[PDB]
Amino acid sequence: SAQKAPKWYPSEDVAALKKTRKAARPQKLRASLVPGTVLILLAGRFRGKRVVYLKHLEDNTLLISGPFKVNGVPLRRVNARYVIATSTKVSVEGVNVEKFNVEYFAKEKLTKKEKKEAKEIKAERVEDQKVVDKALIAEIKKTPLLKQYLSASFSLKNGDKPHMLKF
Amino acid sequence: VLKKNPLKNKQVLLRLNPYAKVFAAEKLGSKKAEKTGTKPAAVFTETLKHD
Amino acid sequence: RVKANAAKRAEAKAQGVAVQLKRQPAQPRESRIVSTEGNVPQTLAPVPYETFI
Amino acid sequence: TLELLKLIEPYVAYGYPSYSTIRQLVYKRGFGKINKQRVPLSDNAIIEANLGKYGILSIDDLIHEIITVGPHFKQANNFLWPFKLSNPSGGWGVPRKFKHFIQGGSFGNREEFINKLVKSMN
Amino acid sequence: PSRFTKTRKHRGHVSAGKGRIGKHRKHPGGRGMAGGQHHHRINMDKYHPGYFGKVGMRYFHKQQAHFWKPVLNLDKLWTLIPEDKRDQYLKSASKETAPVIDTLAAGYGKILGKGRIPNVPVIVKARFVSKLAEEKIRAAGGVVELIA
Amino acid sequence: GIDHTSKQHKRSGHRTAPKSDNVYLKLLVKLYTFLARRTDAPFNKVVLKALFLSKINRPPVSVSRIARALKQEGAANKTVVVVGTVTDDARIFEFPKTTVAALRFTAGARAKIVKAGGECITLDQLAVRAPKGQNTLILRGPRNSREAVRHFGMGPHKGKAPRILSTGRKFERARGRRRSKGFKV
RNA sequence: GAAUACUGCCAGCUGGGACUGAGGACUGCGACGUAAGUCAAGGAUGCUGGCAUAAUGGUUAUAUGCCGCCCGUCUUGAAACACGGACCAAGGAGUCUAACGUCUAUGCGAGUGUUUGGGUGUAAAACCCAUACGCGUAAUGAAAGUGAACGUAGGUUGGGGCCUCGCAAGAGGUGCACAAUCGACCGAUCCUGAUGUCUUCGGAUGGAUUUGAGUAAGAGCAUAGCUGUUGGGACCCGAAAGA
RNA sequence: AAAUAUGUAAGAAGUCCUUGUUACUUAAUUGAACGUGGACAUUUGAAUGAAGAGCUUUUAGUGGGCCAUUUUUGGUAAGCAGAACUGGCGAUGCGGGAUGAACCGAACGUAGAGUUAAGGUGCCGGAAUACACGCUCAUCAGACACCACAAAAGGUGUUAGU
RNA sequence: CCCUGAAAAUGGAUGGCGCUCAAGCGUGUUACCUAUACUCUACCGUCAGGGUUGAUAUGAUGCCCUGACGAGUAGGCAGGC
RNA sequence: GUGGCCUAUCGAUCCUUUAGUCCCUCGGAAUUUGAGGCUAGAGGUGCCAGAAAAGUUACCACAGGGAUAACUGGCUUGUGG
């Protein structure tokens, strides 16, 4: 024989796991994040954009839509740690947000065999975008310069210290 | 298997010392003390000021 | 000490049990009051230097 | 015991602990000497199994026998494993440790200032 | 087996267990019994006292066969009788028919008296016998007859 | 760093298993390891330790020593336990009817105990008929009767036997052993 | 008459940062709950995304930041301006034997040892064996010589274990080995000197600040192993010499 | 006539109460030594610690030392020679003293996080060109113990004081 | 405190550059830096204390629980290649 | 009262010799000389735990030693300047 033998072999029977005492208690948001607050996106393809915060979704994310007719940001999810909560506020008692939730934004089960070597928006998504934009735009127009404020991007000038700035 | 510190983890603090619940409930850590109006003798204050 | 200890133990057998046969070191002093009556505290600072030669 | 302390002055700092210091010390860093092993207290039944013959049946019973020097202080203290304190969090407050506390250092009897030192050292 | 020796464990270590200062040499303190009176004196005087000097008188042409006299004790005397007949002789402690024990054929010269034989008469034949030995055979009812 | 008041990593200094490779002795050690762990009887612990001993730490126990032990009043009906060999003795002319539990019996010792009317018992049968060592009597041989002990502690005025190869006159009975030749020891 | 500072306490509340996630059914201590259960209470889970390959990672070369003196030896002290070493391959130094000490394993044990030799053989093997002899079972003395129980093989103090009573704590009894001590016995030395008698022999009793490598219900013998010792070339190499 | 250093004791192998042995001792039924029997509790006779406490065999290497504080001898002195107690190096890495066998801190399995020691925070170089009160201007300033040096004397330089 | 006293030979040493209400001297208060040191966690090994047989799913020199510890020449022993 | 008021004033094995015990041995058996034994002293080793011991080498040899001298260098600076 090339190698003799192990006298006794380790058992192949997988052991179960101990009961884990970790209850999933709900998230505790920071005090500056209330619906209608204008947020600044710190990351993502829409970084630096001014957006209007609407709803806190079940998976701890934030549903947000800086009005698509204003700056082109649609209704989408964001992570609360990747945004800056400003002080300007927008009333939001004209939107209906119980329809939007996690399974609404669930993307797809991407087929592994589906690979693209060289290389459309749902009509239900665009209709919701229109409906919520109507209420949002109709209110922000009450107070001056908000539309242009939401249309412009955010950036740090020379000599800008975020550790002492206010947002 | 793991030493959990009291003075934190109130579950452990209550596993020991069942009296810590009563201490916290009645707020014995901020016991307001009864006022007494005794005054030092004139000889004590005189010698304290004395050079 | 053994003769006195035997007598104390035998006396404590009748009355005063747990007579504390053992010795003890010098304990720290207990509280006390120091009265000022007729004994007002008074002293001065260090004395300056002088030769005396 | 005062002669022992007077004989190891240059190597120790000691003082008079308060109830606050004693309670926090025993709760956080208190271990037992059970069968010559360092057993974390962590439970009232561990203490009552090794000190219940002396009328001590809880961690506050152990703390009581320490803060006030009871008849069974020697047995309770010898049951306690020596505390393994860490370096002070705010530092020693002194450029050089090895001078007497009166002479500006850190060793010697520091009266009631041991509470500030110990609470930072654990 | 050389594979169990400590030499196989000193391979790689310079001094091979013999020290770096002592520097294992040929014969540092002499050869054989050298210096039993000068520099090995303490070892002689402590572990082998009486080594040096003459004591007693000399025996020219000493033949060890003249002094041949193996001793046997009373507590071993009954072992010369065979085990099969030992029990039947021990019972019925007779004087008219007592066992005859011949220590010469058993290879012994003198019988000593470490004592406590059973109270059974025996006929003991021996070249020599100590005083207290014979007194115990006679106390047990037997007799000692001397042979040559 | 620690001010070590005693040697670190210090072994017990006692045998925790027999040095031998006797499979049957190992079986006995495993039987009495179970008994010592699972019973509170201190007889089991003593026998377990005594099974570990070396050949010179378990001297043979004579049948005369067994008989002498049986003469102790109240010990006549006890079982004699010898962790080691039991040897024959022709100096004793009567042997009581007893039971001896020993590791090994010499042929003469086995015959004599049986002839008296008793039986020779192995240690496993001892545990079956006495799991806690009820009414047992542990006997041990004389450790200091070895001829190796005579030379232990040799020194002046100690009264010990020197290590020698030949006895008699002309062999260490001279200067150092009499006043007539220098000094005496 | 207040406040504040300073010092101290809270089994007061609360925010941000970092490191760690060890175990792997249940058992425990708790807390909140009328209970049912739940829980941050004897060690991490849940949700999500990208990639699924050189992407992470290993190896290697390079660069960069910091550190890094030439190994071996003698030595109080070595990188030394102390000695050996230009380089590589192969060889190269605690071995065997006679006798022995402690310890360990083994077999039998008051015995132990077949192998000098004989029988036998499938033939330097294996198997079987008589008488002897070696060591032990008796010591002491220069020697001639003598030669080990007053006693449950002694008393005392401890002593594991066992037994009795006890729920227990403990109290009694027996107590191997072992340790300390005082006795008894054997040999030597010093002394005393009974019956008796080849009248110079015998040495009975009784003692001692004496002495033994002794007895006081034997432990040894043989084989094997590490280590140690002595003699041998003796861990290897090396004289100036002598015959 | 110190200080430091050093002997002994702080019990069960003890104490107390009765009374047995002897050839010693006493004028003696006196003592001495050793005992029989009985009594003594739970703080069994100060504190602290106890890592198990005792005992025995057998064998290695070593038997050139040196340094530091303090005591100290010879010498003018010596990185000189010779002693005492203790701690070290030899046998030992690590952080600091730039550098070093002995100094300061701390002694070492492999990693992670936190806090410190001795020492430091202009730059080299990680860390306050921090704060506060004063002194000094050197045409040879000074800048950390071991340590790598300076004296007697003098200066209407300047500052404080009698 | 500063200055005179104050002279040695290759060119050199508060470690260097440099420093003058100091980056010097005396003193004080804080903050901060980092050791193989201290604290907690993990792993390796050693040691000690233990658990485990109405068959421990027939390996009890196995498996497991708990605690502490880890410097090293000459040297000793053990487990291995 | 077991030498000097106390603290120093001294000597192994082997051999020789003396005193004592009248003792043991001369091993085929005895007697007597002789010799050898046992116990205790002396005769001596002063290098005093105790070999029996004259020089020279500028003709030299070996094993080593910086454990140790004859240069330099280093510490010191009595002496010198």
Ligand SMILES: C[C@@H]1C[C@@H]([C@H](O)CC2CC(=O)NC(=O)C2)C(=O)[C@@H](C)C1
């Ligand atoms: C000087 C003279 C002799 C001397 C002694 O016998 C000399 C030597 C003889 C010998 O070969 N070996 C030794 O041990 C001693 C002795 O006894 C003295 C009293 C008398």
